[PDB]
Every structure is written in structure tokens, then in C-alpha cells.
Design a protein around this ligand. Structure first.
Ligand SMILES: CC(C)[C@H](Cc1cn(Cc2ccc(C(=O)O)cc2)nn1)C(=O)N[C@@H](CCCCN)C(=O)O
Ligand SMILES: O=C[C@H](O)[C@@H](O)[C@H](O)[C@H](O)CO
Ligand SMILES: [Ca+2]
Ligand SMILES: [Ca+2]
Ligand SMILES: [Ca+2]
Ligand SMILES: [Ca+2]
Ligand SMILES: [Zn+2]
Length: 316
């Protein structure tokens, strides 16, 4: 909508207060004009038609409980925008400042979130399994990273390329969480999963096995569920990425960690310059090696740590 840029205030899902960029034109809309061609958050109103109505509020204060998922969806899209711009020099998900749109209050008691090819969608959770999923910055960045991948490598959402697609989203979801630096970890979705159970999550990058995900190529799922297990076999890549950053010994294979930022530079480059829609695991290894090479030199620790990590998860 056409109107004047302003700043609203409200509370997110976890009860935290934050300012949000809005647009005024009779009502205050969740439209952020300070980032690229804009960040727009919508109300799906418990239904599934998308995107719904551009979020509208009479007084620019968003402290209702109904407001919280939109507050966080909107704010964390902005944070994720900032990560990609400041850290990888990338403008929005298409690299050309595409408008970022999100809808919240999708369906009823919907325990999930997703990128539908054109926008982010967030359920409110059933309240026991999940709380509104936009309360999770790793979730928000996971979903926007799916748009990044779709505009770059275009990894097909099936089998090994689909597992890579997933890992990429968990990896930058996590790097963005660290970036915001609020209770960061290598777990996914912990902030909005099972409010009544502390310490769990949907997936663990540091120890995928925690939730039954493989942490080695010899443990890969080869059935047809989950698109050929894209959320399952992603643990093999998540584990490699964790090792590259943090280091460790895994099934007897030692990795020297090079830290999060270099992990991020290497995988961003692999994603945007080498990976293709049908890249498999072994191809990912060669892309990451070439990326590390480009960035740090063939003889680097960096290159050597990337090899160690993939050796440790059995990917040659
Ligand atoms: C953290 C978050 C990003 C997420 C987690 C997620 C949510 N669900 C549903 C779900 C529902 C109930 C339980 C339970 O323990 O009772 C667990 C999981 N399964 N996985 C997830 O990974 N969602 C998918 C959804 C889009 C997938 C496209 N097919 C994705 O973004 O890849
Ligand atoms: O835990 C192993 C150290 O990270 C070296 O490698
Ligand atoms: Ca209000
Ligand atoms: Ca966290
Ligand atoms: Ca996390
Ligand atoms: Ca929990
Ligand atoms: Zn995903």
C-alpha cells in the first residue's frame, strides 16, 4: 500500500517487546519500506487461502496475543534480510530486492510452516506440540532460505538434492539465529516446539541421531517417504556443516572447526556458484571444496577441514 513509513511496537510469541517497521494509510500496516522492495506480513485468519489480508492495525501497537505471530514473522523476516545483505551482499531472496511476503494464522492448530513458491506461511501450532512457528527465528530464516535456494542452485526437493536443499535451510536458519545472537544453538525450532518440554527440538545439527536422523552416509534413508527423506538425510549434511564450523571427532574422524562465518561463506558460495538442481551429496562435497579453495586457497586449513568433515559423515 502507498503511505508513510512509521515504526510500531509490540510483543512477539515469546513475550519479548520489539519495534517493527510499518506503513501508515488510515491504518498501520505490517509493511516495511526500509528493506529492498519491502517486507509484507499478512493475516490468513485461520484459513488456508493465501496470502490473506495485508496486516492492518488501528494504533500501531501490537501487544494483542493475536498480534504476536505477525510481529515475529515481520521482524524476523527483516533480520534475515539483514543477514543476507550485510553478510553475503545479497539483496532479498532473488538477489534483486524482491518483496518478502509472509502470512500467519494459517489454518487452525497448524503444526508447521513453509515456503509455497512465492511466500512464507506460518501455522499457529496446536498449542501443545507447537506455539506460533514465526516465534522461531531459525524457522523464519529456514523458510526464507528455501526461497534463496530456489532462486540459486534450485535443488530439486527430492532424494539427495532435496536433503541438501533442507540442510542449506537449517544451516542458514542457524547462522541467522547466531547472527541475531539470541540464545543461539545448532538445534532447529526449539523456541516454538513443545512449550511444556524443555531442551528438545525438531532436529539437531550437532547430533542428528538425537531425533533419529542419520549422521553418516551409511545410515541414509532410501525409502520414498518425506520425498525420499529430505528431512532425514539432511542430518548427514547438517552434521558435516556443524563439524566444519565447530570441529570434533566423529566415528573416529577428527575435524578442525573454522568457525561459523567461514562455514557461511563457503556454503553460500557453493549454493550460489556451484550447486545445481540435481546435485547429490558427493557433488556437494566437491562444490564446498571448490568454494573453500576459491576463498582460502588450495592449501588452506579451510579446504582441509571441509574434506575432513565430509570424510567424517562418509561422503566422498
Ligand atoms: C522447524 C521447522 C522449519 C519444521 C519442523 C516440522 C514441523 N513438522 C510437523 C510436526 C508435527 C507434529 C510433531 C510432533 O512431535 O507431534 C512433529 C512435527 N514437521 N517438521 C520443518 O522442517 N518444516 C518443513 C515444512 C516445509 C516442507 C515442505 N514439504 C520445512 O520447512 O522443511
Ligand atoms: O574435537 C576434535 C577437535 O575439534 C580437533 O579436531
Ligand atoms: Ca493495535
Ligand atoms: Ca535458540
Ligand atoms: Ca535453533
Ligand atoms: Ca520444547
Ligand atoms: Zn525446509
Amino acid at each position: 500500500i502507498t503511505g508513510t513509513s512509521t515504526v510500531g511496537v509490540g510483543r512477539g510469541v515469546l513475550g519479548d517487546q520489539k519495534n517493527i517497521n510499518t506503513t501508515y494509510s488510515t491504518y498501520y500496516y505490517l509493511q516495511d519500506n526500509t528493506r529492498g522492495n519491502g517486507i509484507f506480513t499478512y493475516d490468513a485468519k485461520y484459513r488456508t487461502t493465501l496470502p490473506g489480508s495485508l496486516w492492518a492495525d488501528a494504533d500501531n501497537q501490537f501487544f494483542a496475543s493475536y498480534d504476536a505471530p505477525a510481529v515475529d514473522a515481520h521482524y524476523y523476516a527483516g533480520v534475515t534480510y539483514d543477514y543476507y545483505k550485510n553478510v553475503h551482499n545479497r539483496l532479498s531472496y532473488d538477489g534483486n530486492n524482491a518483496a518478502i511476503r509472509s502470512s500467519v494464522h494459517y489454518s487452525q492448530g497448524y503444526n508447521n510452516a513453509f515456503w509455497n513458491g512465492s511466500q512464507m506461511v506460518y501455522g499457529d501450532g496446536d498449542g501443545q506440540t507447537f506455539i506460533p512457528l514465526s516465534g522461531g527465528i531459525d524457522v523464519v530464516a529456514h523458510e526464507l532460505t528455501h526461497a534463496v535456494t530456489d532462486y540459486t542452485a534450485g535443488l530439486i526437493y527430492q532424494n539427495e538434492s532435496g536433503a541438501i536443499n533442507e540442510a542449506i535451510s537449517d544451516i542458514f536458519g542457524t547462522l541467522v539465529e547466531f547472527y541475531a545472537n539470541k540464545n543461539p544453538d545448532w538445534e532447529i525450532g526449539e523456541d516454538v516446539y513443545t512449550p511444556g518440554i524443555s531442551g528438545d527440538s525438531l532436529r539437531s545439527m550437532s547430533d542428528p541421531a538425537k531425533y533419529g536422523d542419520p549422521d553418516h552416509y551409511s545410515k541414509r534413508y532410501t525409502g520414498t517417504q518425506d520425498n525420499g527423506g529430505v528431512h532425514i538425510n539432511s542430518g548427514i549434511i547438517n552434521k558435516a556443516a556443524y563439524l566444519i564450523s565447530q570441529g570434533g571427532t566423529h566415528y573416529g574422524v577428527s575435524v578442525v572447526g573454522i568457525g561459523r562465518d567461514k562455514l557461511g561463506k563457503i556454503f553460500y558460495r557453493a549454493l550460489t556458484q556451484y550447486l545445481t538442481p540435481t546435485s547429490n551429496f558427493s557433488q556437494l562435497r566437491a562444490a564446498a571444496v571448490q568454494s573453500a579453495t576459491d576463498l582460502y586457497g588450495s592449501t588452506s586449513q579451510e579446504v582441509a577441514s571441509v574434506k575432513q568433515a565430509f570424510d567424517a559423515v562418509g561422503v566422498k
